[PDB]
């Protein structure tokens, strides 16, 4: 009956007895460590909301950019390790702008997510170079954009693969926020309703108060392009809620 | 040999590499496969242990056809067996193209033996977990049967077995005299041996997988006809009973 | 922390303890369990301490069907009063920074109860000394000065090989890296001047059944446990290396 | 791997400045179970080794230990058969390279030097293990006549006149030195009889034509030839009389 | 069209070589004494970021030399610049000299970048 | 100090400026249509290559769109280049519009014309 | 150094926080049937069946922290007769904190009358079996009784080579050492997440005397309640 | 106890002649969701159980489209699934692009096995931890191919892998003869019944948690979403 | 190094954070027309010139930075940053922006903390300076590679305590002029270390000027009047 302490978590390629790569799950835990970021997609576009929680007032909220603008028709919200997301964001921007420069066509958000995945999975696959990709990225991206297909919201975890979702909450309040999303959603949701619900749930799952300073939100719409709400617009929306 | 059995590039104090021995014994774990090199040709026999009825007949086939003339019976891990079969196919095709005629069995045997030995040399790659019997017959070369132990030995056999019942199979084979007869009786004899070595209590069931190469099949490795396999199975069952 | 199985609190006055150690692999524990099964040493108590990670299971030494249905905690002690023989049995891995409290508690237990000689079966690393382990026999001994001189002369007559006294930080303090618990336990015993001996063996991680057989033979040669087929292996020595062959693999 | 132990890692030196992996390779050569001899006569070079065939199903013809690298250079192998065959193939490749580049036949000295360099590579790089086999090269040299060179996994390639390798190497070497000190004519028949009787007396068994295999290279015929069982039987009769 | 302006310069002491592929605006630049494609990064002016967006295509990620040179060259010129710096260590001061070296050539031959 | 051969030939109605620059590590095959770099794909032959035989060139997109069509196109375009280049890893900056067998053959013969290996 | 380690030791140690708002639980009120639920499935089955009739007033919660799981350790008593106690512990208790948890629950003054029924689930791979793990039934369960339990187990006992560690083993060892009747049920399930098959396998226990009269039958109410917790936190993208 | 020393890496052989890492990979498939694969004399139906959670969070696309006559379902890790699907798509597209012929299913499975064998042999790698149920229709006819995480693959009449798939296996083994001689609708209903028996007693086959991909004699591999599975759910008995 | 903790923490970055915590207190203030840096000093230097132990440096003329942690990696990152600044000044021919160099350093730290062949930098670069238009700047990178703009940051020995004290103290009234910013930085440093004096390594940079290492005589006289104000 002599049990010996045995651990399989150190090896990234090492399987657990039931077939679990513990390093990837630890990356998901690091994801949970990050701030909440909830994005909702509707027939009128995709809404992206995320908390710019700050440490001490000395922190400048302008520096924090949880929502980026990969392309005019592509946006992305993040939660977790921003430094990790920097490389993926640069790769996505390079792909989009290079496609526009060469083929004079707007690269589809699905293909951008694909390429980001190729970059994401490179930590495990190949990694031929000595100082090559080593660890999975500890950051999750809500690639919200509108393409020929229409409003498309994608989500990637440190696993390294994107999935097309409709309403996801990623971060510290991964669940609970998702329960609120489930309670509030339908195919008939309008953009205004989506924004209102997203900000309401942000307030519900936030420890601070909903003010334009500590919150950031954007909407990617078919007719329009990526439009990050300004301070005045954000204040108006939170006043509505 | 504790401590010295984790890498294929580590010598034990006795002076043996334990990874290769573990590969051989993992080959032992699988069901027994038997090959015979009679005067007419080479006859193969494998105890294809059926796992579930869901698998369609012919799945997990153990008798591969490297080329028209050269066949192969395998044991141990089947993935490594398939990889080695592909490698042997490539080598045989390369020789047939560059030189223009079918490869002598000795050349394929020692080339694959060198490859598996190379795998056994290095610490990074692990030794192959499969042992196979490269057997073939040629009107000029003659009936040849070579077993490729994961270690990397290329020994010509007149008859040998590989698997869990390897010892009893070898005893029965050496009781048999494998010289100067047609393969028509060798198929029956090998089926008989497979029936004896099979353990019904442990192994729930098995399927007879017989292939042969010789003058009867014009020096081509082909699965035995259904009628001949049925006759051999009937003879083996009759011999086993009482 | 000795808790009797019943309520009589059997006294271990004038007894000899047989404790294992968490050595390379499980040589000490395996040998201890092997001798327990061979000698049919009945359970007498439960040494409940806060030093090992808890574990439970049926009786390792099933023997009879009635005895099969029992409970085996991480730390249990069996004894054979016929030969004034008592034996602890460790079957658990240690909690961080808890081995030394175990050493102190067990030293106090043996001092108070009266168990005279504590035998610590263990195992050290294969390389051990500066190529001396490869040249010399793996078996060694390490007996405290308080050990009875009769046993010392018996060992001398046995013509055994003493501990190499591996060089450590001052200059030749006995070091047993494989055992781990063995060094601190020996130091605690020496401070308490409690008669005890460490019987180790230079081995490496892996299958250690032959090492356990060698160690129990060493102990038999010293104290004539059985007869200086032979040892009745426990029923616990089953499925100790695998959980069946997956059919799809082969 | 990071194998700290000296006994299970080639690179690390033993505390007494010894390479335990090389010693274990020698023990592997012993584990081969067979013994081989080689004698450099005044007219030829001989190599005699026993051919113990397990059982009878194994084809006695296929199992062999006498190999030829270059048409004038012979060889005898001792140790694991896989390692022996690998070293034989590497020696053949080296001979082919020498013939192609330099244009003339590879001298035995240079062939053993190259094999010793390969053995040094094996015993220095931690990646691979020393090949568990000892190879003895024989051949006819235009300047030194018959030449006997023994290469070993350690990287030691000194040439010999009479040498042996295997489980009975020590006793065979003792008897061979005893014979050498007499220093008789060392004729073809003389040297062959010396080698075969050395093997027979060290193994303390009677030899049969099929129980052993003999190969010889002579000045009259530089091409290496493996003596047939008929010649071995004739030589055995010669010893008998 | 693509003007393959291949040239060499005795940067410091080693005769580091250079390669140019004009295309239309996707200039390609290679650097290295030995003919090896060790690293490669593509950078071009971006309307979303002040620094031109660049990604390490292939090679060691912990180099930040090819990417930086590509960004600076893409800011100097327009469109893409496929820098392929392939110096082993070269410390870091030597890289500045190469940046000077290529700079002089662009002034000498604006067409043959 | 590298060797580059460029052949601008108008096949299938598109002026493909095939460029082939020979590096020791990776030969760069630039099949540039629209006069731009376009997608960059890396084809790395398998090191083992069975018993020193035809290898498996790992298809990997470095820049542009990930598509099995473009992967196979690069495979067929640079397979012979890698095989005749001593089993050397070869990169391809393909930027073509239409991907069909006739176009592939035309580009293949154009590269053979502009060969530097 | 040492001070930092001491701070970590506090962070890891179990702290007993009363739910009614350094005395241990059993030291405060004695119990007669203390039910322990370890794991999400065990507590889910408890809430579904046992915590269906009665007040089940919250008495305490043993909040703790570890690198694996910080969930909850709320303790309950029926409050119709406080003699019977309960515990829904979902947070994973580390090895260095299991004995601290035992001290907080019992301490050093046990009653020696409780039929400690432990509810926990293990994985099939843990089950040491002669045949392959794939041949075993998915939800099958096992039992571990103590010396003075004397009540027949509803399921076969574990085999010899098989063992159990962690908190259930801690409580069972405490009971055995101090001679407290008990039984440790192992629900070997392939799925460790919240699945109603695991609780269906846990069902046979309510039939036996252990946790017999606490459940007020009503399978329909319990069965409907089981579908309530079937909804859980969104999984990751690792498996599909 | 001893197996702990011989399971850290994939290149180590246990004293029992086993590689436990391959066993752990083979369990990784069980870690995934259940899928059912069965075929008839003219059709090959691939029925998969979408995770019974809020599909808003993630559209679990277990059934993937490979070619016009090959499609697969995911059971296990998603990264390996995506890599294998991409590889199969490359090979099929290359065949149809160069030789202008549909790639036979058996050849594709052989290539998959050869590709997945390499990680097992090489150091620092891991076997592809996903099980594929390849439902294809080449010249020979319908083919359901079981691809284990190990390179070993099986040509199967009816199969089901994933969590709690043993009940589905039992159901399939109990009705093989019916599967062989069934039409499209009956075969799909049989697969759905197998999946239902995979599901607990309380849970039933809803449109939200069921996806099916069918390839046939004149039917290209078509994935039927939640809206497109109702026709088969209708007419299927609850019992 | 490349493995995550069960909670999702990379061990290497946390160890680098601990190394930073053992470093000196790099304190900066984003004043208008003036940016002030401040780093705690271990005095000593009984036989060593202060020139070689200058923790506060100047990356070109419009950027100056201070670090907290190991000084070797700090020296190499400073060398790389100044080389990048010179290369930009050469090619682009524009004054390097504080944002630009801060992002470069953050990217370098990210690269070094990602690959397992190299360990992360065990420092936290606190970068200040003035942009082309003269806007004061204040940034602080981390071994992880997260660059964040701050109003008045403080990282090093007892980072949290000095940070919260400065947050309580930092006000636009305290940021007006430049003497007030100097008082704020000196107050934070003195709160960190009571000895003061030589331990207070002070550096100031104005809008159109270069980095001026404030002389020790100036540092102590400001301390004296700060003491006078308290009484």
Which position has the token pair 């199992």?
D63
DSSP E1-44: ------EE---SSS--EEEEE-SSS-EEEEEESSS----EEEEE
| Among E101, E85, E89, residue whose Cα is nearest residue E10 | E101
Q: What is the dihedral of CA A194, A195, A198, A202, to 10 degrees?
A: -170
Q: Where are the alpha helices (DSSP H) in chain D?
A: 20-31, 81-102, 108-124, 169-182, 188-203, 229-240
Q: Where are the alpha helices (DSSP H) in C144-227?
A: 149-158, 181-192, 209-223
Please name the residues in contact with A179: beta carbons below 8 A apart, sequence gap of 6 or more. Answer: none
| Among I19, I27, I111, I121, residue whose Cα is nearest residue I78 | I121
CA distance D180 to H222: 86
Please name the residues in contact with I81: beta carbons below 8 A apart, sequence gap of 6 or more. Answer: I59, I65, I101, I104, I105
Please name the residues in contact with I229: beta carbons below 8 A apart, sequence gap of 6 or more. Answer: none
CA distance H122 to B83: 13
Which position has the token pair 């970590």?
G8
CA distance A81 to A31: 8
Cα–chain-centroid distance for residue D96?
Answer: 20
Which position has the token pair 């997440």?
G193
Residue H28 contacts A, CB cutoff 8 Å: yes
CA distance F70 to B21: 46
Measured between CA atoms, the residue of chain D closest to residue C130 is D15
CA distance B111 to B90: 11
Residue C172: how many other CB atoms lie within 10 Å = 10
Q: Which chain A residues are closer than 8 Å to C33 by Cβ? A: 2
CA distance I142 to I155: 10
> Six-digit token pair at G107?
């301490």
User: Which residues in chain H are immediately followed by a break of C to N over 2.5 Å?
Assistant: none
CA distance H209 to G236: 17
Residue A62: how many other CB atoms lie within 10 Å = 9
CA distance A64 to A49: 13
Phi/psi for B193 (5° steps) reads -60, -45
| DSSP label of H2 | G
Please name the residues in contact with E7: beta carbons below 8 A apart, sequence gap of 6 or more. Answer: E17, E18, E20, E105, E112
Torsional sign, CA G89, G90, G91, G97: positive
CA distance A122 to A131: 12
Q: Which CATH number characterizes residue F27's domain?
A: 3.30.230.90
Please provide the CATH number assigned to the domain covering A9-241.
3.60.20.10
CA distances from I175 to H4, I31, I34, I133, I191 (A): 63, 5, 9, 19, 18
SS3 annotation, C19-57: EECCCCCCHHHHHHHHHHHHHCCEEEEEECCCCECCEEE
Residue A236: how many other CB atoms lie within 10 Å = 12
Phi/psi for B165 (5° steps) reads -95, 35
Q: Are F27 and F20 spatial neighbours (Cβ–Cβ below 8 Å)?
A: yes
CA distance D200 to D185: 22
Q: Which chain I residues are closer than 8 Å to G67 by Cβ? A: 5-7
> Six-digit token pair at G128?
């040491």
CA distances from I226 to I41, I42, I190, I205, I223 (A): 19, 22, 10, 21, 5
Q: Which chain F residues are closer than 8 Å to A98 by Cβ? A: 37, 63-64
- C-beta atoms of H93 and F76 within 8 A: no
Q: Which chain C residues are closer than 8 Å to A3 by Cβ? A: 53, 55, 91-93
Structurally, how many domains does chain B consist of?
1
* Touching subunits for chain D (3+ Cβ pairs under 8 A): B, C
Crossing angle of the two packed helices B78-99 and H105-121, in degrees rounded to 10: 110
DSSP C117-145: EEEEE--B-SS-SSSHHHHS-SB--EE-T
Residue I131 belongs to domain spanning: 1-231
- C-beta atoms of A129 and E58 within 8 A: yes
Residue F15 belongs to domain spanning: 1-117
Where do the domains of chain D lie, and which CATH numbers do they carry?
A: 1-241 (3.60.20.10)
| DSSP label of I155 | E
Q: Are D98 and D106 spatial neighbours (Cβ–Cβ below 8 Å)?
A: yes
> Six-digit token pair at I162?
């000095």
Residue E22 contacts I, CB cutoff 8 Å: no
Where do the domains of chain H lie, and which CATH numbers do they carry?
A: 4-237 (3.60.20.10)
CA distance I202 to I45: 16
The count of C-alpha atoms lying within 13 angstroms of the C-alpha of H44, restricted to the half-sphere facing its C-beta, is 26
Q: Are G79 and G55 spatial neighbours (Cβ–Cβ below 8 Å)?
A: yes
SS3 annotation, chain B: CCCCCCCCCCCCCCCCCHHHHHHHHHHHHCCCEEEEECCCEEEEEEEECCCCCCECCCCCCCEEECCCCCEEEECCCHHHHHHHHHHHHHHHHHHHHHHCCCCCHHHHHHHHHHHHHHHHHCCCCCCCCCCEEEEECCCCCCCEEEEEECCCEEEEECEEEECCCHHHHHHHHHHCCCCCCCHHHHHHHHHHHHHHHCCCCCCCCCEEEEEEEEHHHCCCCEECCHHHHHHHHHHHHHHHCC
Neighbour order of strands in the sheet with I211-213: I154-155, I26-31, I34-40, I200-206, I211-213
With touching defined as 3+ CB pairs under 8 A, do chains I and C touch?
A: no
Torsional sign, CA C157, C161, C167, C168: negative
With touching defined as 3+ CB pairs under 8 A, do chains D and I touch?
A: no
- Residue F115 — left, alpha, or beta (φ > 0 → left; ψ -120 to 50 → alpha)? beta
CA distances from H63 to A157, G204, H163, H223 (A): 20, 37, 16, 7
Q: Are I92 and I121 spatial neighbours (Cβ–Cβ below 8 Å)?
A: no
The count of C-alpha atoms lying within 13 angstroms of the C-alpha of G227, restricted to the half-sphere facing its C-beta, is 10
CA distance E94 to A97: 32
Measured between CA atoms, the residue of chain E closest to residue I80 is E92
CA distance I143 to I70: 12
CA distance F7 to F31: 10
Data resolution in angstroms: 3.0
Q: Are A24 and I6 spatial neighbours (Cβ–Cβ below 8 Å)?
A: no
CA distance H10 to F95: 41
> Six-digit token pair at H221?
């591999």
Q: Are A169 and A25 spatial neighbours (Cβ–Cβ below 8 Å)?
A: no
Q: What is the CA radius of gyration of chain D?
A: 18
Q: Are E95 and E16 spatial neighbours (Cβ–Cβ below 8 Å)?
A: no
With touching defined as 3+ CB pairs under 8 A, do chains H and E touch?
A: no
Q: Where are the alpha helices (DSSP H) in chain A?
A: 22-33, 82-103, 109-121, 177-183, 191-204, 231-240
Q: What is the CA radius of gyration of chain C?
A: 18
Q: Which chain C residues are closer than 8 Å to B76 by Cβ? A: 250
Q: What is the dihedral of CA C46, C49, C50, C51, to 10 degrees?
A: -110
Crossing angle of the two packed helices H105-121 and H78-98, in degrees rounded to 10: 130
Phi/psi for D168 (5° steps) reads -95, 30
Crossing angle of the two packed helices C209-223 and C27-39, in degrees rounded to 10: 60
CA distance H230 to H227: 6
| Among H202, H215, H209, residue whose Cα is nearest residue H230 | H209
In terms of DSSP bridges, do strands G33-38 and G116-122 run parallel, antiparallel, or are they unpaired? parallel
Neighbour order of strands in the sheet with D35-40: D162-166, D35-40, D44-50, D212-218, D225-227
Please name the residues in contact with G1: beta carbons below 8 A apart, sequence gap of 6 or more. Answer: none
Q: Are H79 and H72 spatial neighbours (Cβ–Cβ below 8 Å)?
A: no
Q: Which chain B residues are closer than 8 Å to H151 by Cβ? A: 79, 82-83
Encode burial over I205-224: b for 16+ CB neighbours within 10 A, e otherwise: bbeeeebebbeeeebeebbe
Which position has the token pair 């301070």?
A231
| Among G83, G105, G101, residue whose Cα is nearest residue G93 | G101
Q: What is the dihedral of CA C129, C134, C138, C144, to 10 degrees?
A: -20
Residue D93: how many other CB atoms lie within 10 Å = 12
Q: Where are the alpha helices (DSSP H) in G13-116?
A: 25-28, 40-49, 95-105
Phi/psi for C183 (5° steps) reads -65, -50
* Touching subunits for chain C (3+ Cβ pairs under 8 A): A, B, D, G, H
Residue C244: how many other CB atoms lie within 10 Å = 17
Q: Which of A20, A23, A135, A170 best tests the I interface by mutation, with the highest count of I CBs <10 A? A: A135
**Quick one: which H or E segment has residue A50?**
strand A45-51
Cα–chain-centroid distance for residue I159?
Answer: 12
- C-beta atoms of B52 and H173 within 8 A: yes
- C-beta atoms of H56 and A165 within 8 A: yes
CA distances from B5 to B10, B23, B87, B120, C205 (A): 7, 11, 28, 13, 10
Q: Which CATH number characterizes residue I191's domain?
A: 3.60.20.10
CA distance I106 to I140: 9
Q: Are D201 and D193 spatial neighbours (Cβ–Cβ below 8 Å)?
A: no
Min CA distance, H98 vs chain G (Å)? 33
Length of chain H equals 239
Q: Which CATH number characterizes residue B109's domain?
A: 3.60.20.10
């Amino acid at each position: 009956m002599f049990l010996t302490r045995s651990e399989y978590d150190r090896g990234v390629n090492t399987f657990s007895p039931e077939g679990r790569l513990f390093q990837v799950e630890y990356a998901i835990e690091a994801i949970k460590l990050g701030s909440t970021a909830i994005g909702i997609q509707t027939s009128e576009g995709v809404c992206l909301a995320v908390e710019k929680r700050i440490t001490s007032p000395l922190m400048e909220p302008s520096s924090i950019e949880k929502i980026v603008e990969i392309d005019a028709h592509i946006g992305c919200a993040m939660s977790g390790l921003i430094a990790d997301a920097k490389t993926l964001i640069d790769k996505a921007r390079v792909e989009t702008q290079n496609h526009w420069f060469t083929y004079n066509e707007t690269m589809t958000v699905e293909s951008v997510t694909q390429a980001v995945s190729n970059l994401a999975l490179q930590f495990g696959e190949e990694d031929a170079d000595p100082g090559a990709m080593s660890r999975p990225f500890g950051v999750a991206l809500l690639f919200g954009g509108v393409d020929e297909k229409g409003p498309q919201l994608f989500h990637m975890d440190p696993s390294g693969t994107f999935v097309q979702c409709d309403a996801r909450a990623i971060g510290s309040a991964s669940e609970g926020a998702q329960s609120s999303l489930q309670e509030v959603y339908h195919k008939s949701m309008t953009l205004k309703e989506a924004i209102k619900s997203s900000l309401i749930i942000l307030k519900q799952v936030m420890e601070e108060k909903l003010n334009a300073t500590n919150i950031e939100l954007a909407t990617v719409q078919p007719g329009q392009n990526f439009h990050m709400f300004t301070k005045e617009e954000l204040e108006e929306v939170i006043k509505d809620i | 040999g504790t401590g010295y059995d984790l890498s294929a590039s580590t010598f034990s104090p006795d002076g043996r590499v334990f990874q290769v021995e573990y590969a051989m014994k993992a080959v032992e774990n699988s069901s027994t496969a038997i090959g015979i090199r009679c005067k007419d040709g080479v006859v193969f026999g494998v105890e294809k242990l059926v796992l579930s009825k869901l698998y369609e007949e012919g799945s997990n086939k153990r008798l591969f056809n490297v080329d028209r003339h050269v066949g192969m019976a395998v044991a141990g891990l089947l993935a490594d067996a398939r990889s080695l079969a592909d490698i042997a196919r490539e080598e045989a095709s390369n020789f047939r193209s560059n030189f223009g005629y079918n490869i002598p069995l000795k050349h394929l045997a020692d080339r694959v033996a060198m490859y598996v030995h190379a795998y056994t040399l290095y610490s990074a790659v692990r030794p192959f977990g499969c042992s196979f019997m490269l057997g073939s017959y040629s009107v000029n070369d003659g009936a040849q049967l070579y077993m490729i132990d994961p270690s990397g030995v290329s020994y010509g056999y007149w008859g040998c077995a590989i698997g869990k019942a390897r010892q009893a199979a070898k005893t029965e084979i050496e009781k048999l005299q494998m010289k100067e007869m047609t393969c028509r009786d060798i198929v029956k004899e090998v089926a008989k041996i497979i029936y004896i070595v099979h353990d019904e209590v442990k192994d729930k069931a098995f399927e007879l997988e017989l292939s042969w190469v010789g003058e009867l099949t014009n020096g081509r490795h082909e699965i035995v006809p259904k009628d001949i396999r049925e006759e051999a199975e009937k003879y083996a069952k009759e011999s086993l009973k009482e | 922390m000795f808790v009797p199985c019943g309520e009589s609190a059997p006294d271990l006055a004038g007894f000899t303890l047989l404790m294992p150690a968490v050595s390379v692999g499980n040589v000490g524990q395996l040998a201890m369990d092997l001798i327990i099964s061979t000698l049919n040493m009945s359970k007498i108590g439960y040494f409940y301490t806060d030093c090992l990670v808890p574990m439970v299971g049926n009786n390792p030494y099933a023997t009879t069907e009635g005895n099969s249905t029992e409970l085996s905690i991480n730390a249990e002690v069996y004894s054979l009063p016929s030969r004034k023989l008592v034996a602890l049995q460790l079957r658990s891995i240690f909690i961080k920074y808890k081995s030394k409290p175990f050493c102190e508690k067990l030293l106090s237990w043996v001092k108070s109860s009266g168990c005279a000689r504590v035998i610590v079966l263990s195992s050290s690393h294969s390389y051990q000394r500066n190529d001396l382990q490869l040249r010399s026999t793996p078996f060694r001994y390490l007996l405290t000065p308080s050990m009875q001189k009769s046993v010392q002369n018996k060992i001398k007559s046995l013509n055994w090989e003493e501990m190499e006294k591996s060089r450590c930080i001052p200059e030749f303090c006995i070091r047993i890296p494989g055992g781990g618990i063995t060094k601190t336990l020996y130091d605690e015993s020496c401070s308490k001047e409690i008669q005890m001996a460490v019987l180790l063996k230079f081995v490496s991680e892996g299958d250690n059944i032959p090492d356990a057989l060698g160690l129990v033979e060493y102990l038999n040669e010293w104290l004539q446990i059985l007869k200086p087929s032979r040892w009745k292996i426990p029923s616990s020595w089953r499925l100790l290396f695998g959980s069946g062959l997956p059919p799809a693999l082969f | 791997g990071s194998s700290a132990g000296f006994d299970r890692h080639i690179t690390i030196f033993s505390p007494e400045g010894r390479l335990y992996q090389v010693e274990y390779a020698f023990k592997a050569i012993n584990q081969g179970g067979l013994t081989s001899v080689a004698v450099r006569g005044k007219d030829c070079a001989v190599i005699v080794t026993q051919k113990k065939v397990p059982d009878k199903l194994l084809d006695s013809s296929t199992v062999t230990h006498l190999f030829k690298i270059t048409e004038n250079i012979g060889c005898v192998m001792t140790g694991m058969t896989a390692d022996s065959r690998s070293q034989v193939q590497r020696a053949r490749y080296e001979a082919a390279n020498w013939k192609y580049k330099y244009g003339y036949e590879i001298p035995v000295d240079m062939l053993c030097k190259r094999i010793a360099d390969i053995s040094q590579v094996y015993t220095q790089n931690a990646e691979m293990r020393p090949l568990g086999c000892c190879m003895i090269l024989i051949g006819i040299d235009e300047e030194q006549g018959p030449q006997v060179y023994k290469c070993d996994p350690a990287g030691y390639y000194c040439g010999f006149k009479a040498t042996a390798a295997g489980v009975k190497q020590t006793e065979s070497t003792s008897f061979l030195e005893k014979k050498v000190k007499k220093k008789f004519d060392w004729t073809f028949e003389q040297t062959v009889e010396t080698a075969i009787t050395c093997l027979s007396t060290v193994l303390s068994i009677d030899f049969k034509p099929s129980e052993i295999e003999v190969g010889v290279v002579t000045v009259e015929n530089p091409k290496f030839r493996i003596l047939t069982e008929a010649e071995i039987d004739a030589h055995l009769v010669a010893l008998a009389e | 069209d693509v003007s393959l302006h291949n040239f060499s310069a005795r940067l410091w002491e080693q005769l580091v070589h250079f390669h140019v592929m004009r295309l239309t605006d996707s200039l390609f630049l290679w650097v290295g004494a030995t003919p090896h494609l060790r690293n490669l990064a593509v950078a071009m002016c971006s309307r979303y970021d002040s620094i031109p967006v660049s990604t390490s295509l292939l090679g060691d990620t912990s180099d930040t030399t090819s990417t930086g040179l590509a960004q600076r060259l893409a800011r100097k010129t327009n469109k893409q610049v496929f820098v392929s710096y392939n110096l082993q260590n070269t410390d870091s001061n030597f890289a500045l000299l190469v940046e000077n070296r290529i700079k002089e050539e662009m002034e000498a031959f604006p067409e043959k970048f | 100090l590298v060797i580059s051969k460029q052949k601008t030939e108008v096949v299938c109605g598109v002026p493909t400026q095939v460029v082939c620059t020979a590096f020791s590590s990776h030969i760069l095959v630039v099949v540039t249509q629209f006069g731009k770099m376009g997608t960059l794909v890396s084809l790395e032959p398998s090191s083992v290559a069975s018993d020193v035989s035809k290898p498996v060139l790992t298809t990997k997109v470095l820049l542009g769109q990930d598509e099995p069509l473009i992967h196979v196109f690069a495979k067929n375009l640079v397979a012979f280049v890698s095989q005749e280049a001593g089993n050397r890893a070869v990169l391809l900056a393909v930027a073509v519009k239409d991907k069909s067998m006739e176009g592939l053959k035309a580009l293949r013969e154009v590269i053979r014309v502009c060969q530097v290996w | 150094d040492r001070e930092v380690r001491l701070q970590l030791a506090r962070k890891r140690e179990v702290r007993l926080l009363r739910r009614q708002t350094e005395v241990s639980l059993l030291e405060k009120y004695p119990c007669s049937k203390f039910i322990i639920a370890i794991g999400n499935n065990a507590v889910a089955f408890l809430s579904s069946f046992v915590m269906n009739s009665g007040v089940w007033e919250e008495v305490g919660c043993a909040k703790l922290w570890n690198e694996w799981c910080r969930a909850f350790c709320v303790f309950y008593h029926l409050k119709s007769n406080p003699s019977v106690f309960l515990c829904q512990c979902s947070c994973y208790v580390a090895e260095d904190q299991q004995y601290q948890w035992l001290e907080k629950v019992f301490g050093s003054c046990p009653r020696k009358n409780m039929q400690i029924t432990i509810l926990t689930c293990r994985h099939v791979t843990d089950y040491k079996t002669s045949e392959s793990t794939g041949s075993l039934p998915s939800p099958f369960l096992r039992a571990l009784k103590t010396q003075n339990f004397k009540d027949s187990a509803c399921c076969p006992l574990l085999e010899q080579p098989n063992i159990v560690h962690d908190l259930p083993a801690a409580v069972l060892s405490y009971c055995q050492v101090w001679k407290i009747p008990a039984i440790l049920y192992l629900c070997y399930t392939d799925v460790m997440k919240l699945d109603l098959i695991t609780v269906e396998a846990f069902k046979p226990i309510l039939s036996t005397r252990s946790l017999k009269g606490l459940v007020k039958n009503i399978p329909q109410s319990t069965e409907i309640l089981k579908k309530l917790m079937t909804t859980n936190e969104i999984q990751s993208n690792i498996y599909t | 106890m001893f197996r702990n020393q011989y399971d850290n890496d994939v290149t180590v052989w246990s004293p029992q002649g086993r590689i436990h890492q391959i066993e752990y990979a083979m369990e990784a498939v069980k870690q995934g969701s259940a899928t059912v694969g069965l075929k008839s004399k003219t059709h090959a139906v691939l029925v998969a159980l979408k995770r019974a959670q809020s599909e808003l969070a993630a559209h679990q696309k277990k059934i993937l489209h490979v070619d016009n006559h090959i499609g697969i379902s995911i059971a296990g890790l998603t990264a390996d699934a995506r890599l294998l699907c991409n590889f199969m798509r490359q090979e099929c597209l290359d065949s149809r692009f160069v030789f202008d012929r549909p790639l036979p299913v058996s050849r594709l499975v052989s290539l998959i096995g050869s590709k997945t064998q390499i990680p097992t042999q090489r150091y620092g790698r891991r076997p592809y931890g996903v099980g594929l149920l390849i439902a294809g229709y080449d010249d020979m006819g319908p083919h359901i191919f079981q691809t284990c995480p190990s390179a070993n693959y099986f040509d199967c009449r009816a199969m089901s892998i994933g969590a709690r798939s043993q009940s589905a296996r039992t159901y399939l083994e109990r009705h093989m003869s019916e599967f062989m001689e069934c039409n499209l609708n009956e075969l799909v209903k049989h697969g759905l019944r197998a999946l239902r028996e995979t599901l607990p007693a309380e849970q039933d086959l809803t449109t939200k948690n069921v996806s099916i991909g069918i390839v046939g004699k004149d039917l290209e591999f078509t994935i039927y979403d939640d809206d497109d599975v109702s026709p088969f759910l209708e007419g299927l008995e609850e019992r | 190094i490349t493995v995550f903790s069960p909670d999702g923490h990379l061990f290497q970055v946390e160890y680098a954070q601990e190394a930073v915590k053992k470093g000196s207190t790099a304190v900066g203030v984003r004043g208008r027309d003036i940016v002030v840096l401040g780093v705690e000093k271990k005095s000593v230097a009984k036989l060593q010139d202060e020139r070689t132990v200058r923790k506060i440096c100047a990356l070109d003329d419009n950027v100056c930075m201070a670090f907290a942690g190991l000084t070797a990696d700090a020296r190499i990152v400073i060398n790389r940053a100044r080389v990048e600044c010179q290369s930009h000044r050469l090619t682009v021919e524009d004054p390097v922006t504080v944002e630009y160099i801060t992002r470069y350093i953050a990217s370098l730290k990210q690269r070094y903390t990602q690959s397992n062949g190299r360990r992360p930098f065990g420092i936290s670069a606190l970068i200040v300076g003035f942009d082309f238009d003269g806007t004061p700047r204040l940034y602080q990178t981390d071994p992880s590679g997260t660059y964040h703009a701050w109003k008045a940051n403080a990282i090093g020995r007892g980072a949290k305590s000095v940070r919260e004290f400065l947050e309580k103290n930092y006000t636009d009234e305290a940021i007006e002029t430049d003497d007030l910013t100097i008082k704020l930085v000196i107050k934070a440093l003195l709160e960190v270390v009571q000895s003061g004096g030589k331990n207070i390594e002070l550096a100031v940079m104005r809008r159109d000027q270069s980095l001026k290492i404030l002389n020790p005589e100036e540092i102590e006289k400001y301390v004296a009047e700060i003491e006078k104000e308290k009484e």
